[PDB]
């Protein structure tokens, strides 16, 4: 019962990374629940355009922190081989709690 969470900024970077974990997992593991989105949390930013004073300007900025999950029940030492050190993405964070 290895709970795998994948939080990232680029949904392409996660999608792939979540695929990379999904592929070599059915190869040496057992029955996988697949990748699941959450939610996804955004951080809006309502700033004014001009540095001067024109309240009516304002540029909108966002920051989506996507969330992914891949569960793996019936954990074998074999499975933990392929998924030991076989990563590739750079703007992705993972945390496992089993």
């Amino acid at each position: 019962k290895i709970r795998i969470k994948l939080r990232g900024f680029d949904h392409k970077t996660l999608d792939a990374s979540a695929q990379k974990i999904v592929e070599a997992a059915r190869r040496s593991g057992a029955q996988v629940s697949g990748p699941i989105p959450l939610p996804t949390r955004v951080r809006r930013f309502t700033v004014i355009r001009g540095p001067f004073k024109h309240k009516d300007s304002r540029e909108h900025f966002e920051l989506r922190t996507h969330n992914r999950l891949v569960d793996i029940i019936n954990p074998n030492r074999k499975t933990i081989e392929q998924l030991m050190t076989l990563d590739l993405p750079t703007g992705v964070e993972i945390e496992i709690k089993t």
Binding site: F9, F45, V47, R49, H60, F61, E62, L63, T65, G91
Partner: protein, 60 residues
Amino acid sequence: ARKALIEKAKRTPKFKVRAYTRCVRCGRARSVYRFFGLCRICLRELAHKGQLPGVRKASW
């Protein structure tokens, strides 16, 4: 932003109520965002260059 107040506001004060924020970059203090630590001008100037990851342009 006078050097006298940037470097100043950094020193640990005798009362924690006194500690205010400034932009790490511009030195502005009228309105900096905690999440990044920059003035509303600086937030922009960077977001554009793309120097603040995951920081896109909103649209809905």
